[PDB]
Write an enzyme that holds these catalytic residues in place. Structure first.
Site, PDB file in Angstrom:
ATOM      1  N   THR A 193       0.957  -1.283   0.020  1.00  0.00           N
ATOM      2  CA  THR A 193      -0.030  -0.173  -0.389  1.00  0.00           C
ATOM      3  C   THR A 193       1.376   1.461   0.026  1.00  0.00           C
ATOM      4  OG1 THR A 193      -1.753   1.645   1.009  1.00  0.00           O
ATOM      5  CG2 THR A 193       0.167   0.045   2.576  1.00  0.00           C
ATOM      6  N   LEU A 194       2.360   0.651   0.240  1.00  0.00           N
ATOM      7  CA  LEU A 194       3.097   2.047  -0.516  1.00  0.00           C
ATOM      8  C   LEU A 194       3.431   2.523  -1.595  1.00  0.00           C
ATOM      9  CD1 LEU A 194       5.813   2.695   2.643  1.00  0.00           C
ATOM     10  CD2 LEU A 194       5.903   3.274  -0.291  1.00  0.00           C
TER      11      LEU A 194
END
Lengths: 227, 233, 240, 235, 233, 227, 252, 242
Positions: free
Chosen positions: F1-2
């Protein structure tokens, strides 16, 4: 969460009194200090030989130079022993030197005292003897369920402990050898015990003049049974 | 002696609320009258002695710009409701610009008068409010008994002698009634339930006229004028 | 004197406030669940609803399911049961988030049995008052029926009746080896019980009170409420 | 009896939990209120309570959502709490999504709010039963007892003299096949009249009544419009 | 216990655990306040074992702020805990309002906390009845009695403590309006031990002005004591 | 999710007369390296809806689990066929998931498409989710084609193409799409879109998966475009 | 009020624990486990605990077992209230897994039993819980290849025996197991090398026939040896138990 | 909830006192005695040791006259079990004050701070009050040598010479007669010796049952305790003076 330990109208904590009557009806422990060490002993009435005796021994080690023994509920001993060690470890983290007895006891006493007061919990049903060697000398402390503590030359805590006191009062001198201390401890357990078979049914833990607290094994107990 | 606060009677009612109903039969016998020109509230003061300043003791508070209120029962236990209302009432005026409906203002008091039940305090209040304001839909007048059953009255009385006061109101009161009549109707009731003197040192007339729609207590002159009507001495 | 709180053992050792629950669930609408050669058929005889005469036609249902292949009925408080089902669905959802597979039956029952049991351990919490029957069928392994009582005690059965008239039903289910009798024709044998074996309170007007569903080869082994067009031929009960 | 009563956890030796059975007769002390299900409409009428000759009649009918309305019978405050719960539930669902809250899934969310007040020993079970009258896809009437329980019905009555009111309903099958709300409302009002004891107050334009149906959001029946119904009742 | 209602409603409707608190107050030491134009004298009762128990107990005449007396009566155990909340509150107000706390704000606070405890769960009500002498925003002296029930009211002259009824009825019959500096002390001293002996060691009287509350020393306490017996003879 | 590493690509979801026809290639690329070439990106989350996908793959399999377990939560509390969750509900629920995360700064990079039949006029009241004639006409107003950008931007149209077809197949659709197309008319139109993508879009390939959501159910097939 | 599990009786006893132990013996389920040279075995009566529920009517007895296995190496045979027994196994199944996770090696057969008795005692000391009426055995193999066997009760007590019995026949089982274990010791063959099949398992089985005087239908017991060369707490199939039940013509 | 088993330790009585606190006063009036004197040179504190047997150490330790700081020491008279919790606590307050304001805490600011914790247990929490009441002595640059007597409720009181414990009426009675206002350390000791003796109705104490200590600021709060070897010397002056 309310206190179950309440002052009776006469000022006696009737709950502590009831706990003591459980202490004063358990297998008698015993501890004596000498000039060069301190001895703690307890009698373990020889049960059916189904049980492995060497896995229920009551004398337990707290730290390098501090041992313990109790007289009462086995259940509340394991919990108190385990929480006694962690406090001993915690002191050793902050200070390099191994914990000293006189305040290890104050830690335990302020722990047993809490359940005398905080709600929803009964007081511990046991009396402990913490013996150890420290730079201020040898020590032998006793902890009531009430939390009040005493310093002892020698004492008995289990059942039949009133005459075992009078037995030790007349066979104890401040200058006493560690080997002599045993034969004034085996006999007082031997005389108190009924059906005297004092072998494989007795526990001895010694200080040994600034050596690690060692529990005398089964070999080292028969050779102390010359009398 | 023993049973908890959340305990139903073998009949259905809770114990504590039905116990508190004894308390609300204590204080001043206030009377509130609702007419199409804004409501009027009057109450008594039996001052304990000449020492009490008579000015720091109040029976008719003011919940907001436009809501009066009346006390009964545990006066100390009541300020913790009036103060609570005074906070939510201004909290309402902040989020939404308009003033508060009495039905809403009375509702949020009741939702706290029975917070002891736990769906934070732990015992029911011993009060009986007589809130009445002139927000909209004309003036209103409600009654928050401890059991949280707020009922929109038209002319009700609260206090020790409320049973005798609610009878005089139940007879003389008529829906078609002007404010000048409304003021004297209250006094006639209080004159029949209090002690000897209907002087300024005995009554607490305050009103919220529908014209101004603002709370307005009566000073010593606006209160002495009414008492002169005196239908029967 | 010892039966007030659930947390105190009676001097006889028989923990009261848990046996009192057994009386309660033994006085509510019976629920039945037995295993046939093709699948599990359940049953729920809401015999206490005959006063009302205003219930919707088939509203009141006790045959709950979960994951569309596990049947959960009950017999007790209609609230305490539904609390468990919500936990049972939640327990199955937590499994799927964490394992990408519908929870196998023989551990869902435990994680409910613990949940039921955990409420019998406190001053405050009131122990649950509803037995639970959990069931499922597989083609590889024949079906299995788990019954749960208050205070845990999950057991595996092959047919069980729980409720008010549970006793003499059991004597009548074991008459035939239903593990060989097919599910399709096993409904009639169930009606021949409810009509007679119940407390005479279901006669000829029970198409609404009794509601049962199975999981069999007709439903591809998934929870299927039985269509009424199967029930009506199964009401060939003309006896005496 | 004297012992198994103090708290709401103890089970009586018969397996009967008293404190919820004691709170389940608070509804029996509430005023009558009848809900009738048509094929396409739901009619709820309730007899308000006038606690005094001066006091206004209290409130017996509440609105929840556009097509959902209830009717309490019991402790008013315990009823007020459940209104704010369902109002703040339909509004949430109408905000979280854009649908309308499924009526059955709304009753469950309130039929299990009772229970959480039954399990714990520091909470009391709600006194009030409800008639959740709503129309989502097919008209529906639900009732929630003080013990967590709910049902779907075709007709109801609560408490005050509900025995007589049930007699009118348990005998009438007209209601389903009956269109012409006017006839249904007369069917419902007469039922309430049966509960209302004679030699006492009769049904006046101070009895609450509301309808909800196909294109009919939950709406009151106005005083001016309800007045002509009252004439058709006496005959 | 802990977090449970311990002050609940009696069958008669009263709150028992407050009713007992009022009985605790009667087992205290009498305290008297007297008002005047701007200065308010206070005298109280002290009981001390002779030759021991040095008079640093200073139970009553607790200073709150620059200009705020307090002469409580009742459980000294519940005194410091109550006072130390006010002295703290006196400052949280001064910090958030940047003006000295008016006496009318204080009395509202003292009664608020006292009533707060008789309303929460698992807390014993305070067994202390206090009276506060101080100045409002307009420089106007005002004595504010209080009771453990939470009620309060201003007073021109109010006395509390052991046998408050007897002392009060004496103080309500010979009270002037704008007395002298010396006259007020004499009325307080004359009244304070109408319930106690004449011994000047028991009474200690203190006086309050605009600035720096003054403690009256033994000289004129003894000298006025020399004047009261000759009145009695 | 980065950051996205294993990312999908464009999907196209038009509606024709018998129901939706949502198509997607079957490649997930680990940056500039076609690591996976048989990944499926069109999941069934109901008997009447599908759920498209673009952007990073780690979050479909997240958002797949969220819906697929919400679906069964419905499937447990269903008494009538009208209690099912319409595709509008999901798309208004997925929109909440993306928006509530935009309040934080973890968006779960995606371009989710929710597509399905928003009606119950066709009997499917027996859900064989675990294991599973003629099409019916559909009023073109009962079909809901959602869309959710990773900023919460949501809307519905007649045809929603996301990812990278929004620059290539959207132009073809915006001028060649007519209401109430037919089976083979939609497929050839889509095949004239993906064939455009496969030529000009680097992160896309052949081996299309085409999913149709008709009045009978959700059907699959795996063409292989011919240039 | 001796209703509490905390308030000491005037004589000092905790009457709740004595009541809790009584409830265990009411289940009348016998469970015997004996320890041998590099082998430990355990038995239980494979019956539903006598409770409010009806007796064995229609169940499938292939699913009533009083023995569980905490991990792949440490078994146990909980006996008590069936609800509490399962809670103990799950609490045990966590303390054993937490220990493995936080220390990287399997928990000893005795530390696992010592942890539980610390959890068990916490209930005893506090007032708002209830005693887990569940006393059972725990067997396993330590790191020195020595078999282990521990018993714990509703009161925290982790003594640890060499041949132990739990149930309701402890009045006599103290002696029948006492003399019958001496027989194996008395024999001075020493030619028993991994011969646990005919020395330890049959010893426990013929120990059960004597505690309760039934004839031990093979579908009424389950045995679970944890001997070396298995070390895995395997449950012995019924095809093998009935072999030792034929060993009555020459053994005992 | 288990309200049946509760005792309401923090509730009033039909008169206005508290049962648990009133009972605690009974408990602390059955323990040993403890004496406190203020002289012109220093504060004295003495207490009669409770005797269980001759096997106590009785040489270096004693549980009646503890230490709180270099200038504050207290004499417990009550349940010694829970007195420690007010020693490990009252020591903190004297150290928190030093940590905060960087000066030694005045005694009168310590008594009020230890009574309040002793008093919060009689207000809420539903726990038994602390069965301990103990003198406190100290020296200050503010008002010199100070003595304070606290009670299990918390209501403390300043003092000049106090003799709490069992038989306190007699020990107060004798102290009320022979205590000069201005006095000396060495002569001060014999007053505490005498009142200890007469309190336990013995002409001469056993010098193994009594324990004494004193502050006597020498610009450093020197604060000597005693050993039984030195207390023998004190009895030498007891026979001669009395």
């Amino acid at each position: 969460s309310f206190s179950l330990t309440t002052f009776s109208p006469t000022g006696k904590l009737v709950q502590i009194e009831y706990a003591l009557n459980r202490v004063s009806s358990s297998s008698p422990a015993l501890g004596i200090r000498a000039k060069n060490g301190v001895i703690i002993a307890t009698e373990k009435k020889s049960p059916n030989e189904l049980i492995e005796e060497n896995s229920i021994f009551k004398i337990q080690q707290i730290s390098e130079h501090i041992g313990i023994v109790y007289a009462g509920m086995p259940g509340d001993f394991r919990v108190l022993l385990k929480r006694a060690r962690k406090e001993a470890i915690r002191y050793s983290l902050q200070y390099g030197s191994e914990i000293l007895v006189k305040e290890l006891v104050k830690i335990i006493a302020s722990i047993v005292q809490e359940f005398t007061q905080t709600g929803g919990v009964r007081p511990f049903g046991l009396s402990l003897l913490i013996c150890g060697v420290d730079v201020y000398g040898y020590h032998l402390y006793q902890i009531d369920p009430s939390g009040c503590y005493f310093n002892w030359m020698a004492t008995c805590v289990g059942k039949d402990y009133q005459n075992n006191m009078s037995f030790l009062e007349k066979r104890y001198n401040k200058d006493i050898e560690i080997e002599d201390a045993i034969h004034t401890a085996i006999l007082t357990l031997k005389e108190s015990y009924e059906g005297v078979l004092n072998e494989k049914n007795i526990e001895i833990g010694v200080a040994y003049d600034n050596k690690p607290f060692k529990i005398l094994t089964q070999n080292e107990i028969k050779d102390y049974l010359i009398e | 002696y023993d049973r908890g606060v959340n305990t139903f009677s073998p009949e259905g009612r809770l114990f504590q609320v039905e116990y508190a109903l004894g308390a609300i039969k204590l204080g001043s016998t206030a009377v509130g009258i609702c007419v199409n020109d804004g409501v009027i509230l009057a109450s008594e003061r039996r001052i304990s002695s000449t020492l009490i300043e008579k000015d720091s003791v109040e029976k008719l508070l003011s919940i907001d710009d436009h809501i009066g209120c009346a006390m009964s029962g545990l006066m100390a236990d009541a300020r913790t409701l009036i103060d609570y209302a005074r906070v939510e009432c201004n909290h309402y005026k902040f989020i939404y610009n308009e003033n508060i409906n009495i039905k809403s203002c009375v509702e949020l008091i009741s939702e706290l008068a029975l917070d002891f039940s736990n769906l934070i305090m732990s015992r029911p209040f011993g009060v009986a409010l007589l809130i009445g304001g002139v927000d909209k839909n004309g003036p209103c007048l409600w009654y928050t008994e401890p059991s949280g059953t707020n009922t929109r009255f038209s002319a009700a009385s609260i206090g020790s002698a409320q049973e005798g006061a609610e009878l005089l109101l139940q007879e003389n009161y008529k829906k078609d009634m002007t404010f000048e009549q409304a003021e004297i109707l209250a006094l006639t009731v209080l004159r029949q339930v209090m002690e000897d003197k209907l002087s300024t040192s005995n009554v607490e007339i305050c009103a919220i006229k529908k014209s101004d729609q603002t709370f307005y207590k009566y000073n010593t002159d606006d209160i002495s004028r009414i008492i002169d009507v005196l239908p029967s001495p | 004197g010892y039966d007030l709180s659930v947390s105190t053992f009676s001097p006889d050792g028989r923990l009261y406030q848990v046996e009192y629950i057994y009386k309660s669930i033994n006085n509510n609408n019976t629920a039945l669940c037995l295993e046939c050669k093709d699948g599990i058929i359940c049953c729920c005889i809401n015999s206490n609803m005959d006063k009302n005469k205003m219930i919707k036609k088939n509203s009141y249902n006790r045959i709950y399911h979960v994951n569309n292949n596990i049947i959960i009925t009950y017999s007790g408080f209609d609230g305490d049961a539904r609390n468990i089902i919500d936990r049972a669905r939640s327990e199955a959802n937590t499994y799927y988030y964490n394992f990408h597979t519908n929870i196998p039956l023989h551990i869902l029952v435990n994680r409910i049995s613990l949940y039921i049991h955990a409420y019998t351990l406190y001053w405050h919490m009131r122990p649950f008052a509803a037995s639970i029957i959990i069931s499922s069928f597989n083609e590889k392994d024949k079906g299995d029926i788990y019954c749960i009582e208050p205070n845990g005690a999950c057991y595996k059965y092959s047919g069980i009746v729980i409720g008010k008239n549970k006793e003499m039903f059991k004597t009548e289910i074991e008459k035939k080896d239903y593990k060989d009798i097919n599910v399709r024709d096993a409904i009639e044998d169930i009606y021949k019980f409810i009509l007679t074996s119940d407390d005479h309170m279901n006669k000829n007007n029970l198409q609404n009170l009794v509601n049962f569903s199975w999981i069999c080869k007709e439903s591809s082994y998934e929870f299927q409420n039985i269509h009424e067009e199967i029930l009506t031929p199964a009401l060939n009960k003309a006896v005496e | 009896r004297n012992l198994y009563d103090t708290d709401n956890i103890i089970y009586s030796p018969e397996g009967r939990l008293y404190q919820v059975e004691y709170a389940s007769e608070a509804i029996k002390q509430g005023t009558c209120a009848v809900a009738i299900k048509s094929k396409d409409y739901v009619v709820v009428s309730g007899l308000k309570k006038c606690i005094s000759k001066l006091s206004f009649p209290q409130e017996k009918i509440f609105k929840i959502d556009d097509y959902i309305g209830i009717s309490m019978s019991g402790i008013t405050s315990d009823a007020k709490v459940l209104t704010k719960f369902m109002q703040n539930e339909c509004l949430s669902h109408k905000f979280l999504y854009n649908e309308n809250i499924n009526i059955e899934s709304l009753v469950r969310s309130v039929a299990d709010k009772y229970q959480k007040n039954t399990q714990k020993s520091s909470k009391r079970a709600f006194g009030v039963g409800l008639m959740i009258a709503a129309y989502h896809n097919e008209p529906c009437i639900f009732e929630t007892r003080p013990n967590g329980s709910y049902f779907e019905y075709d007709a109801l009555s609560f408490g005050a003299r509900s025995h007589a009111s049930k007699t009118y309903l348990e005998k009438n099958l007209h209601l389903f096949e009956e269109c012409s709300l006017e006839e249904l409302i007369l069917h419902c009002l007469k039922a309430l009249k049966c509960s209302l004891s004679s030699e006492s107050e009769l049904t006046i334009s101070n009895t609450a009544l509301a309808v909800v149906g196909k294109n009919h959001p939950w709406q009151e029946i106005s005083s001016l419009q309800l007045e002509e119904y009252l004439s058709k009742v006496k005959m | 216990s802990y977090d449970r209602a311990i002050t609940v409603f009696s069958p008669d409707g009263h709150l028992l655990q407050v009713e007992h608190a009022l009985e605790a107050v009667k087992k205290g030491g009498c305290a008297v306040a007297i008002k005047s134009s701007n200065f308010a004298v206070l005298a109280v009762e002290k009981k001390n074992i002779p030759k021991l128990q040095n008079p640093k107990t200073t139970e009553k005449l607790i200073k709150l702020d620059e200009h705020n007396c307090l002469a409580f009566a009742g459980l000294n155990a519940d005194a410091r805990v109550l006072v130390n909340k006010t002295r703290l509150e006196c400052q949280r107000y001064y910090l958030n309002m940047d003006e000295p706390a008016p006496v009318d704000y204080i009395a509202k606070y003292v009664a608020k906390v006292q009533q707060k405890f008789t309303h929460r769960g698992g807390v014993r009500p305070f067994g202390i009845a206090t009276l506060i002498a101080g100045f409002k925003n307009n420089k106007e002296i005002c004595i504010y009695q209080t009771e453990p029930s939470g009620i309060y009211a201003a007073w021109k002259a109010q006395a509390i403590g052991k046998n408050a009824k007897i002392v009060q009825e004496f103080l309500e019959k010979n009270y002037q309006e704008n007395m002298e500096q010396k006259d007020c002390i004499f009325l307080a001293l004359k009244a304070i031990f109408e319930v106690v002996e004449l011994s000047s060691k028991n009474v200690e009287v203190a006086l309050l002005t605009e600035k720096d509350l003054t403690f009256i020393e033994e000289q004129e306490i003894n000298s006025m004591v020399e004047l009261i017996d000759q009145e009695r003879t | 999710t980065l950051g996205p590493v294993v990312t999908g690509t464009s999907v196209i979801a038009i509606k024709y007369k018998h129901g939706i026809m949502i198509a997607a290639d079957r490649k997930a690329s680990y940056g500039s390296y076609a690591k996976f070439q048989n990944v499926e990106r069109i999941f069934k989350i109901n008997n009447k809806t599908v759920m498209g996908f673009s952007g990073e793959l780690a979050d479909a399999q997240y958002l797949h689990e969220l819906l697929t377990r919400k679906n069964i939560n419905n499937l447990s509390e269903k008494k009538r066929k009208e209690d099912m969750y319409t595709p509008q509900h999901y798309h208004s629920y997925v929109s909440r998931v993306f928006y509530v995360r935009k309040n934080r700064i973890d968006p779960l990079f995606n371009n989710i498409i929710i597509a399905g039949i928003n009606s119950q006029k066709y009997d499917n009241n027996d859900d064989n989710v675990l294991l599973y004639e003629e099409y019916k006409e559909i009023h073109k107003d009962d079909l809901y084609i959602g869309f959710v950008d990773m900023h919460g931007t949501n809307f519905c149209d007649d045809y929603i193409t996301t990812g990278y077809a929004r620059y290539f197949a959207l132009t073809l659709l915006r001028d060649h799409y007519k209401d109430n197309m037919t089976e083979e008319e939609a497929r050839i139109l889509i095949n004239e879109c993906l064939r455009i993508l496969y030529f000009r879009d680097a992160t896309s390939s052949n081996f299309i998966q085409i999913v149709k959501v008709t009045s009978k159910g959700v059907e699959y097939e795996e063409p292989y475009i011919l240039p | 009020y001796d209703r509490h599990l905390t308030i000491f009786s005037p004589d000092g006893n905790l009457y709740q624990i004595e009541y809790a132990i009584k409830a265990v013996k009411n289940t009348n389920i016998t469970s015997v486990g004996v320890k041998g040279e590099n082998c430990a075995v355990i038995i239980s009566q494979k019956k539903m605990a006598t409770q409010y529920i009806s007796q064995d009517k229609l169940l499938d007895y292939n699913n009533i077992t009083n023995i569980y296995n905490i991990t792949d190496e440490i078994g146990c045979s909980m006996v008590g209230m069936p609800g509490d027994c399962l809670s103990m196994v799950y609490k045990a199944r966590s303390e054993a897994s937490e220990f493995l996770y936080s220390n990287g090696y399997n928990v000893n057969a005795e530390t696992l039993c010592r942890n539980i008795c610390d959890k068990i005692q916490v209930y005893t000391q506090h007032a708002y819980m209830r005693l887990h009426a569940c006393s059972g055995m725990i067997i396993g193999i330590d790191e020195n290849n020595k078999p282990e066997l521990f018993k714990f009760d509703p009161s925290g007590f982790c003594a640890g025996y060499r041949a132990c019995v739990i149930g309701n026949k402890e009045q006599e089982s103290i002696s029948v197991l006492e003399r019958l274990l001496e027989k194996r010791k008395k024999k001075i063959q020493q030619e028993t090398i991994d011969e646990d099949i005919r020395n330890t398992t049959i010893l426990a089985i013929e120990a059960l026939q004597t505690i309760l005087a039934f004839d031990l239908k093979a579908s009424e017991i389950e045995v679970a040896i944890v001997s070396t060369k298995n070390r895995n707490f395997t449950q012995i199939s019924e095809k093998e138990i009935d072999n030792y039940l034929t060993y009555i013509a020459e053994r005992d | 909830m288990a309200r049946r088993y509760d005792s309401r330790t923090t509730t009033f009585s039909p008169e206005g006192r508290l049962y648990q606190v009133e009972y605690a006063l009974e408990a602390i009036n059955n323990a040993s005695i403890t004496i406190g004197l203020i002289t012109k040179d220093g504060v004295i504190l003495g207490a009669d040791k409770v005797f269980i047997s001759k096997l106590i150490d009785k040489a270096n330790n004693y549980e009646k006259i503890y230490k709180i700081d270099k200038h504050i020491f207290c004499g417990v008279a009550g349940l010694n079990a829970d007195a420690n919790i007010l020693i490990n606590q009252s020591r903190l307050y004297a150290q928190r004050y030093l940590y905060n304001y960087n000066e030694v805490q005045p005694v009168s600011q310590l008594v009020v701070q230890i009574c309040d914790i002793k008093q919060s247990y009689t207000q809420y929490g539903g726990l038994r009050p602390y069965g301990v009441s103990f003198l406190i002595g100290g020296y200050d640059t503010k008002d010199g040598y100070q003595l304070y007597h606290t009670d299990p409720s918390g209501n403390y009181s300043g003092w000049f010479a106090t003799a709490i414990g069992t038989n306190n009426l007699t020990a107060s009675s004798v102290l009320k007669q022979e205590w000069k206002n201005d006095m000396t350390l060495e002569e001060g000791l014999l007053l505490a010796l005498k009142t200890l003796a007469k309190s336990t109705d013995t002409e001469i104490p056993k010098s193994e049952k009594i324990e004494l200590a004193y502050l006597t600021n020498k610009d450093g709060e020197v604060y000597q305790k005693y050993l039984t070897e030195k207390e023998i010397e004190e009895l030498i002056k007891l026979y001669t003076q009395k």
